[PDB]
Design an enzyme around this catalytic site. Structure first.
Site, short mmCIF file in Angstrom:
data_model
loop_
_atom_site.label_atom_id
_atom_site.label_comp_id
_atom_site.label_asym_id
_atom_site.label_seq_id
_atom_site.Cartn_x
_atom_site.Cartn_y
_atom_site.Cartn_z
N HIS A 349 44.60 1.10 -55.27
CA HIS A 349 44.49 0.40 -53.99
C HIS A 349 44.97 1.20 -52.78
O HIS A 349 45.16 0.63 -51.71
CB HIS A 349 45.28 -0.92 -54.05
CG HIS A 349 44.77 -1.89 -55.07
ND1 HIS A 349 43.86 -2.88 -54.77
CD2 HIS A 349 45.05 -2.02 -56.39
CE1 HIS A 349 43.60 -3.58 -55.86
NE2 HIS A 349 44.31 -3.08 -56.86
N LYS A 652 37.33 -11.86 -43.99
CA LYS A 652 37.61 -13.24 -43.61
C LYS A 652 37.11 -13.53 -42.19
O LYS A 652 36.54 -14.60 -41.93
CB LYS A 652 39.12 -13.53 -43.69
CG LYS A 652 39.73 -13.22 -45.04
CD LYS A 652 41.26 -13.30 -45.02
CE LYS A 652 41.84 -12.71 -46.29
NZ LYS A 652 43.30 -12.66 -46.15
O1 LIG Z 1 48.69 -2.84 -51.09
C1 LIG Z 1 48.14 -1.79 -51.43
N1 LIG Z 1 46.89 -1.49 -51.10
C2 LIG Z 1 46.07 -2.44 -50.35
O2 LIG Z 1 45.23 -3.14 -51.28
C3 LIG Z 1 44.30 -4.05 -50.67
C4 LIG Z 1 43.59 -4.77 -51.79
O3 LIG Z 1 42.74 -3.87 -52.50
C5 LIG Z 1 43.34 -3.27 -49.77
O4 LIG Z 1 42.40 -4.16 -49.17
C6 LIG Z 1 44.13 -2.55 -48.68
O5 LIG Z 1 43.25 -1.75 -47.91
C7 LIG Z 1 45.22 -1.67 -49.31
O6 LIG Z 1 46.07 -1.17 -48.28
C8 LIG Z 1 48.91 -0.76 -52.24
F1 LIG Z 1 49.52 -1.39 -53.20
F2 LIG Z 1 48.07 0.10 -52.74
F3 LIG Z 1 49.75 -0.17 -51.48
C1 LIG Z 2 43.86 -11.43 -46.05
C2 LIG Z 2 45.38 -11.25 -45.76
C3 LIG Z 2 45.96 -9.99 -45.62
C4 LIG Z 2 45.13 -8.68 -45.66
O1 LIG Z 2 44.72 -8.38 -44.34
P1 LIG Z 2 44.17 -6.89 -44.01
O2 LIG Z 2 43.81 -6.97 -42.58
O3 LIG Z 2 43.12 -6.50 -44.98
O4 LIG Z 2 45.45 -5.98 -44.20
C5 LIG Z 2 47.28 -9.89 -45.34
N1 LIG Z 2 48.05 -10.99 -45.21
C6 LIG Z 2 47.51 -12.24 -45.33
C7 LIG Z 2 48.46 -13.44 -45.29
C8 LIG Z 2 46.17 -12.38 -45.61
O5 LIG Z 2 45.62 -13.65 -45.75
#
Ligand SMILES: O=C(N[C@@H]1O[C@H](CO)[C@@H](O)[C@H](O)[C@H]1O)C(F)(F)F
Ligand SMILES: *Cc1c(COP(=O)(O)O)cnc(C)c1O
Ligand SMILES: O=C(N[C@@H]1O[C@H](CO)[C@@H](O)[C@H](O)[C@H]1O)C(F)(F)F
Ligand SMILES: *Cc1c(COP(=O)(O)O)cnc(C)c1O
EC number: 2.4.1.1
Lengths: 809, 809
Positions: A349, A652
């Protein structure tokens, strides 16, 4: 009472009202004379929960009978949010409960606001796990989510003097009606000890024991009568262990499940975190093997079990599985390894260096001595294969080793995961490509077949039907309700882009959501936003790579332009920024202070009036996201190209009627591709441009010298314009931007400001703005987590998803 | 299905079965295919609990309407035991539930054995509080029991190698279906800080705050539809307070309600214990005042409130009440004191010096600075009255002071309680007299009107109907069921002392109980007792004043006599001794080892056969008392005269058909008086004899030199006869008996052995033994806690007890 909320039949309403009163009396032990809104919330929760149990019991009985392949999703985070409304939506009970409570003289919306968020996650990674559980249940997969029941989740954020203050999230204080403790299934977990080598195999002895007690929470699929399970472990000390002191020290063992580490994209190598990681893996694997032996040739293990690793956090599952198979079941190494690789799959991720887990060897050595030995053996055998494929390439051997040399020896958990998994995937097309071209290039060259892509998604139940009923309704009116579990059908809305009635309804729903949110802002927090302004929103965790600072530079630019030409017309804007900063992340905390500091100046400048407002949304969490996203006009997704693996907030906003301004990063690329670049506000450096800049060397001074407006902003920050009493309050921020900005905020400043001007120009034309919005909503179907899960199922787990209703309740 | 167990009507049985299945499904989320005995126990518990709630709600509503004077019983201990059967008994649901579960194919007795004991007490003092709650509900008093919800109660005792091992009593592991958390009524408690003197009054500032969360448990009266409340406080840290470390340290505040101090008749001056004592008092008083302001002239406070202090443990209630009235309500000192004295009453439960609470001033000074100041003021004003009544008697002033001079200044809590209470009572006639003639002589001379007696009692519901249904039945057959709530009616049994049928039934019930217990001994613990032998039982906490050692000397005497004349006939005996030793009480732990050591020799001597068996009953607790007491023939109550304030186990044995061998101590005196000395086996020194011996000086050597049999025993102990591998294992015991025995075991040895011979002689005549038993059961009526509570109500609290049924459920 809207269509998509189900039927309110005079048989169900009467039954609900009767069960509501029964719980208020027998369960809460209260009467209508002393009951408070909280008591009513619980009475409703138990009433709705009752409808879930019958389906929960038969679903599990069904899996036992058919014995399908089981999917185990291991994660240290599950950001569930509230459960009441989601349960009603999936059970088609929303209108009935609305009517029933109405007849009892209660406002159901008021009751829903009483529920505490289950904040067992930090942000994107944890919320993804939550959307995934919803989609797996909706697609009829025998899936189980396994994690830790933290008694304290992500901290509640308070803003004092413009600074972030943290306070414990005691979410279990009033109890949790959704979970069911299963103390009878408690399992032991071992720590410390030493390894003994006997005649037949090694033995892990003299260990300290901690018990893992499971709590089960139901996960209902969308109107298909399937209810899966999320099992969360809680730490318990054995009754085995001055008398008083001994009892008080039990809390040493139970601290394992006490609190969630509040970091987003940042690795903190603390012993307690390692204990949490092994704790969840050890208890889960025993549960998995136990359930399997009921389903001893482990050759069929991979045909009946799939373990998905949510990043490297649960990576110890690999050596733990090997330990059990080799040390306990007595299988030969080669056979055990074959089984392990075939059942495990790893999802990466992030590519950010400070987020990758690299555990010091001395820690594993002391805490998990047998696992360290197994890791060394895995490394030895893996490197032998590398040496055989690339003879004489010694540099390659050291780069690919699971053991990292240097100051202190460390184990690269990502390397361990790749070596012990049959599939490795990124979370967005661009991210998965970056993994193959950079970070995991050597591994891709050795085993190309392992690498895949699985673009993230969000569940349309919580993120559309639940949070934006108004929009779900006008959409259902034109194309039916089938899209809720088949989001691709939203494409049919393309034939309404020129429909005057639809255009009007789409814009009306957005305006109502904005009025609804603007109200909430005053009712709670006493603010002063103007519902007619463009709602510019950036909500996500505070982090330098997310670039909330770039947004700040734009806001100050807008402010300076107004002060320069006061009587010139400008599209009114309400800029909203929210998100939590990790407690130990200094720069992130300073960014929050800067935002509130800018608001203090801008919001009280008479000349600005209501043309520009800067608001920091306090305590951003899932429940708040459900309120602000449906009310947004502009979605800010401005991370430096190549840093946001995927992003999910972006999806979203797209599904809820907001246009997007962003960089070609993560899933933004695929979103623009689906909607058409002309319907997206893309700007800035592409990944290739960032690389070129690094080749040459990034010099922020250059931008400062050539852009007058930028120079003015930095001088205002440095002189104390935004911090009168503390002139050098933001010295650290200026110093970073000017001399050590890893994310080159200045490099995308000019293109960002110009793109923002194009956004304002379009907003001035209501009709065309709305038509572009329709173009976005209509092509957001690909981003449903149902699509994502269907791909994991077919391409990684080897199982077929199903939409067949389960034999009623 | 016996009479006294109620009716099993075909409408109730059907309803119970239906609700049982509903809870198993909806509450436990299980089905008949995976349910275990524990699941069935919980399904029954919830079903029975349901019948309690309706009555619980209206009882509290009733008190609100009539607004009677409220009685608050403050105690740090409530030894409740199991709740399922007791609830059924009081609700007349026992036969119905027996039938319902039978039809479901379940054995209710098996299910009852699954319930965990609520062991929130050490022994006599805690069990008394429990019997009192039962009687207060049965007599219709608006009473509330207030205490602490320890997450760990009295430790579970394990015997390893003949030694006591302690293990945590995690009684809440599987949950507690009886309690109802009331987080909405949480109150703050202050600690530490400092005192500030302002223009108008003192202020306690800069304190640390700990929250008190209440949990309510219902207390049903006997078939009168009254259900009172026992409110227990649990410590919670405020969410106010490195991030991770801060969250983990919350357990520092919550440790207050973590564990019960395991001491019986022993004061341990630890800070944590002091915190527990203030914690319960502070939270309780706020609750009391809050409820009162709903019921501001505090002049009527004493007319609406009565606070009973169970020993000195909750003594801080006195200065805390003064603090609130003076510092918060702003009443003048004199008025506040008048109110305080009139609402508080103190019960003393011991005269043993090491059990009296004397807190070091430096502790109070740091933890409760304002309370220390108030205590000094109370002392100053009290001593002024003493000086005025006894001019020039300076020795008297220092003896009566609440402040004790010496090495370290200490506060005598007993003196504080007497000064601030309108009534002070002992718990047995002889004990109350001892208080006036010795320990509190000076106080009695100053305020004679304050001193009273309230002889202890036990509830006939749990201690007869519940644990000995067979006996309750044969008694009911002859005189009806009215005696269950009017035990004095047992006197009518005197006219059956010559009834051949009754004699036979009484003896039959005893034999059945013995067979039942003898079975349990093998089923659990695998023993080998002979049901035809005399069951000689001494169960109570292990303590030197209780003299388990004297019993040991008799057992060894019996053994030596058999070895001396092997083929001589002797009445077979099964000597059973059980009880827990405080973890830090060395001598008590050595006594347990001695008992098991004697059994190791006696139980394996071929020449002894089954004529003598020595068994140590492991983990003695309330649930075990309910099993062994109904099966006893001989009750051992042999404390040194003047040391056992009252005793309550003695009363349980008398009501259940056992004869008593004991000293004229505590309530034994009144028991012998009621039954007639000819029907009791009294022996040993009387209080006056003990005094004479102390005047002269106790020299154990004298007894050793003049009693051959005694000399032999001490030589066997000293030589290693009972500890081959460890010859001097019992050196400490011999040394104590010979040179520093505060309880003069040797002084009562000869008379004890001779009295025991008279017991054996009577046992050889079944008919006459049973007739004496009938004489005891028939005159045990005075010892019902209903009588005790009626006296507290009329002579101390100023309220009239009632037997009127409450207006149905
Ligand atoms: O939180 C992390 N990674 C996060 O994962 C989400 C879900 O795939 C992504 O959408 C996001 O871009 C990423 O920063 C981590 F753990 F890799 F640091
Ligand atoms: C969807 C969600 C996130 C992830 O948002 P990004 O803009 O992809 O970092 C973080 N926090 C909450 C509470 C969310 O619902
Ligand atoms: O436990 C104590 N006292 C005990 O109280 C019970 C109940 O009144 C008496 O029966 C018993 O004799 C006495 O030792 C204490 F606290 F005083 F040490
Ligand atoms: C009644 C009881 C006691 C008190 O017994 P005494 O012989 O008066 O000390 C102690 N423990 C338990 C469990 C009891 O039921």
């Amino acid at each position: 009472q809207i269509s998509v909320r189900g039927l309110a039949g005079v048989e169900n309403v009467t039954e609900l009202k009767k069960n509501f009163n029964r719980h208020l009396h027998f369960t809460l032990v209260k009467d209508r004379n002393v009951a408070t809104p909280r008591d009513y919330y619980f009475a409703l929760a138990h009433t709705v929960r009752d409808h879930l149990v019958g389906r929960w019991i038969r679903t599990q009985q069904h899996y036992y009978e058919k014995d399908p392949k089981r999917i185990y999703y291991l994660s240290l985070e599950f950001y569930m949010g509230r459960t009441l409304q989601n349960t009603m939506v999936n059970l088609a009970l929303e209108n009935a409960c609305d009517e029933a409570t109405y007849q009892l003289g209660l406002d159901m919306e008021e009751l829903e606001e009483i529920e505490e968020d289950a904040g067992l996650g930090n942000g994107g990674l944890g919320r993804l796990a939550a959307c995934f559980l919803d989609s797996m249940a909706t697609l009829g997969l025998a899936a189980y989510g396994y994690g830790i029941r933290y008694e304290f989740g992500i901290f509640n954020q308070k803003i004092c003097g413009g600074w972030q203050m943290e306070e414990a999230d005691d979410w279990l204080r009033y109890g949790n009606p959704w979970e069911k403790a299963r103390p009878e299934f408690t399992l032991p977990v071992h720590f410390y000890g030493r390894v003994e080598h006997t005649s037949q195999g090694a033995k892990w002895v003299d260990t300290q024991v901690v018990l893992a007690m499971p709590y089960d929470t139901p996960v209902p699929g969308y109107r298909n009568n399937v209810v899966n399970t999320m099992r969360l472990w809680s730490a318990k000390a054995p009754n085995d262990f001055g008398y008083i002191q001994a009892v008080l020290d039990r809390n040493l063992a139970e601290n394992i499940s006490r609190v969630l580490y509040p970091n987003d994209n940042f690795f903190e190598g603390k012993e307690l975190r390692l204990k949490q990681e092994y704790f969840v893996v050890a208890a889960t694997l025993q549960d998995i093997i136990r359930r399997f032996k009921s389903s001893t040739n482990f050759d069929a293990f991979p045909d009946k079990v799939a373990i998905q690793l949510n990043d490297t956090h649960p990576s110890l599952a690999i050596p733990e599985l090997m330990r059990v198979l080799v040390d306990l079941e007595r299988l030969d190494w080669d056979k055990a390894w074959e089984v392990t690789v075939k059942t495990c799959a790893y999802t990466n991720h992030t590519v950010i260096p400070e987020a990758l887990e690299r555990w010091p060897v001395h820690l594993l050595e002391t805490l998990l001595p047998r696992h360290l030995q197994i890791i060394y053996e895995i490394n030895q055998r893996f490197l032998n294969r590398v040496a055989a494929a690339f003879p004489g390439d010694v540099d390659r051997l050291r780069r690919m080793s699971l053991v990292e040399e240097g100051a202190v020896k460390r184990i690269n958990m990502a390397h361990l995961c790749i070596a012990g998994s049959h599939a490795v995937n990124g979370v967005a097309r661009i991210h998965s490509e970056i993994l193959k071209k950079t970070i995991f290039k050597d591994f891709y060259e050795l085993e190309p077949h392992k690498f895949q892509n699985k673009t993230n998604g969000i569940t349309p139940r919580r993120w559309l039907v639940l949070c934006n009923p108004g929009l779900a309704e006008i959409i259902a009116e034109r194309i039916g309700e089938e899209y809720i579990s088949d989001l691709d059908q939203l494409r049919k809305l393309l034939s309404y882009v020129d429909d005057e009635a639809f255009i009007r309804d789409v814009a009306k729903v957005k305006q109502e959501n904005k009025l609804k949110f603007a109200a909430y802002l005053e009712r709670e927090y006493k603010v002063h936003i103007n519902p007619n302004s463009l709602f510019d929103v950036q909500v996500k965790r505070i982090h330098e790579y997310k670039r909330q600072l770039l947004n700040c530079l734009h806001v100050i630019t807008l402010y300076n332009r107004i002060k320069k030409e006061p009587n010139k017309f400008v599209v009114p804007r309400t800029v909203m920024i929210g998100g939590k900063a990790a407690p130990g992340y200094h720069m992130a905390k300073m960014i929050i202070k800067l935002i509130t500091a800018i608001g203090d100046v801008v919001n009280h400048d008479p000349v600005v009036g209501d043309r520009l407002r800067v608001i920091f949304l306090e305590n951003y969490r899932v429940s708040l996201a459900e309120k602000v996203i449906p009310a947004a006009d502009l979605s800010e997704q401005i991370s430096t190209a190549g840093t946001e693996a995927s992003g999910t907030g972006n999806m979203k906003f797209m599904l809820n009627g907001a246009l997007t301004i962003g960089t070609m990063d993560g899933a933004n690329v695929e979103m623009a591709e689906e909607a058409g670049e002309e319907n997206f506000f893309i700007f800035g450096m592409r990944v290739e441009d960032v690389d070129r800049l690094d080749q040459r060397g990034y010099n922020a001074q250059e931008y400062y010298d050539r852009i007058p407006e930028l120079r003015q902003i930095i001088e205002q920050l440095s002189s104390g314009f935004f911090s009168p009493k503390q002139p050098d309050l933001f010295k650290d921020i200026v110093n970073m931007l000017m001399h050590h900005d890893r994310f080159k905020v200045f490099a995308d400043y000019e293109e960002y400001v110009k793109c923002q001007e194009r956004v304002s120009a379009l907003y001035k034309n209501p009709r065309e703005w709305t038509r572009m919005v329709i173009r976005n909503i209509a092509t957001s179907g690909k981003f449903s987590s149902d699509r994502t899960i269907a791909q994991y199922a077919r391409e990684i787990w080897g199982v077929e998803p199903s939409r067949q209703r389960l034999p009623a309740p």
